[PDB]
Design a binder for this molecule. Structure first.
Ligand SMILES: Cc1ccc(N2CCN(CC[C@@H]3NC(=O)c4ccccc43)CC2)cc1C
Ligand SMILES: Cc1ccc(N2CCN(CC[C@@H]3NC(=O)c4ccccc43)CC2)cc1C
Ligand SMILES: [Cl-]
Lengths: 305, 305
């Protein structure tokens, strides 16, 4: 028993992390097969980041300007190209540790593990969610750009995030591995504010099911509700609207526990209207929304990789 | 910026996890050099666990009864012995992925990463603390026994925990890698309750320093206190007493932020007496106590491995 914020094992990704240096800027790259992926702002100085023209800046860069280091051994760059906001550096050696992998663009509300790295070396691993405003709340210092987020299905790593930017408000923005930013953000040091950070309702409900499975049930009540009624309360509290698709996804957890989804919605409604009254749920004093329904099933079942 | 509950990269430990089967019981083992470490209750049936006599049960076991599998390849057991509550299975092949490692017995209040495994396969990684009552609050299902906890210093893995038991209250108990349980617990299915789960004061203070570094400062006040006065409040709220040793350990964080340790203690005192008033600190609505001072410095600095 017990329920913890849990990241995927990071070993398969650790074997893909390299250091990329262009001029006086060093960050992280992802080495898969014979290609290294990294943020294109590696070619920028801190001064360029105010109004960079990446196509023009790149004209002044040759293969030998991108210094790529895997541990203590240097990689030979035999080509480079820009795809959206990432650079693809072709190297003459395929990564011998390349796992089975995919590139995926996730939807807001989906969770993933981040391997925070500096100078190509892993520092730590933690779990994140793509927020509804297309930010993530991570832990990134200077030099962490190029760190990636991922999910694993048995033996296949699905990469979904590369870290690019920190907004003035302390939240983080980045791209998929095709170099397209999540949300409206750009790799320029400018005024770009995040929208409303709404709560991921379906994830809260999944986590309440996890609580019931692991013994925390004080919040269960005698009430039920409807999608439309519940969503009147969700809107008031800046929760995402709950859809029938969400209800269907919660079906398995509802079957395991015997608690109808709309009954759990009534529990959640009372928790929003009355608060926690100083109590806790799975060791939290707020409603956790960075576990997906699949995360809960996975951790409560013991799926391995 | 940003501060997250962060685990060590798990790759070095993933390469050490194997499956151990004795009779009809399967759990995890740790393969380092030519020795596999696992909980001795692998030799028990669910019925033996009520009043097991391990020395007698072991007389009926031979090397060939311990089935050890590393991925898809079987390991040959050439010897076995019991050390306290773990078995050491000598195998004829040294683990080629053995990292630099140490066995450490941690003190209550210290944190570590857990690689949860089932059938020798990693499932996920998360951060834990050795509670003052010598339990840990983990995420363990049947088959997870033998999963280990660890810290990493650059390239050396310090193993400090192996998982053995879940108490009726849903918390977890285990041993160091010499097989000695933390606290008074035993590998028998009996009535053993955990003591008071007091809060790790020095860790709370470290996390408040982390909050200040990352922008959350609403809780800073105009007050100070003394160790003795603060500890009168700590006792009331089931917090560990703060010692001068704790104050000294917080010195570096105090120097970086310019906030005297006793001033932060006064902030913590007001938070205990008045609550959070519906506010949050680093995304938490309660006072987090599973970051050590070293954890905070590490994550706020970007140390790598
Ligand atoms: C001692 C002991 C040991 C094991 C178990 N059982 C092991 C399996 N476990 C599966 C449940 C899982 N949790 C969900 O929410 C879910 C959803 C869809 C499919 C599957 C699941 C339940 C508990 C029980 C006891 C008392
Ligand atoms: C854009 C940018 C980039 C980098 C930085 N600085 C990088 C280094 N960083 C070290 C601090 C660290 N945090 C502690 O609490 C601690 C304790 C003991 C020793 C060291 C530390 C501080 C911030 C600042 C800005 C504005
Ligand atoms: Cl909380």
């Amino acid at each position: 028993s017990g329920f913890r914020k849990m990241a995927f094992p990071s070993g398969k990704v650790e074997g893909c992390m390299v250091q990329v240096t262009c001029g006086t800027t060093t960050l992280n790259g992802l080495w898969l097969d014979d290609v290294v992926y990294c943020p294109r702002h590696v070619i920028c100085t801190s001064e360029d980041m105010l109004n960079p023209n990446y196509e023009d800046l790149l004209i002044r860069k040759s293969n030998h300007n991108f210094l790529v280091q895997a541990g203590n051994v240097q990689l030979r760059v035999i080509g480079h190209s820009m795809q959206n906001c990432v650079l693809k550096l072709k190297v003459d050696t395929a990564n011998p540790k390349t796992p089975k992998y995919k590139f995926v663009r996730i939807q807001p509300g989906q969770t993933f593990s981040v391997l925070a790295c500096y100078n190509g070396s892993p520092s730590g691993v933690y779990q994140c969610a793509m927020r509804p405003n297309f930010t993530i709340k991570g832990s990134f210092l200077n030099g962490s750009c190029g760190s990636v987020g991922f999910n694993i299905d048995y033996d296949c790593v699905s990469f979904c995030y590369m870290h690019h930017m920190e907004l003035p408000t302390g939240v983080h923005a980045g791209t998929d591995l095709e170099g397209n930013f999540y949300g409206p953000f750009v790799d320029r040091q400018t005024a770009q504010a995040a929208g409303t950070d709404t709560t991921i309702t379906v994830n809260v409900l999944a986590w309440l099911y996890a609580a019931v499975i692991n013994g925390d049930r004080w919040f269960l009540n005698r009430f039920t509700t409807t999608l439309n009624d519940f969503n009147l309360v969700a809107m008031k509290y800046n929760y995402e609207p709950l859809t029938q698709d969400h209800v269907d996804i919660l079906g398995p957890l509802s079957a395991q526990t015997g608690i109808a989804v709309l009954d759990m919605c009534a529990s959640l409604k009372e928790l929003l209207q009355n608060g926690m009254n100083g109590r806790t749920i799975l060791g939290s004093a707020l409603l956790e929304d960075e576990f997906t329904p699949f995360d809960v099933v996975r951790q409560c079942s013991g799926v391995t990789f």
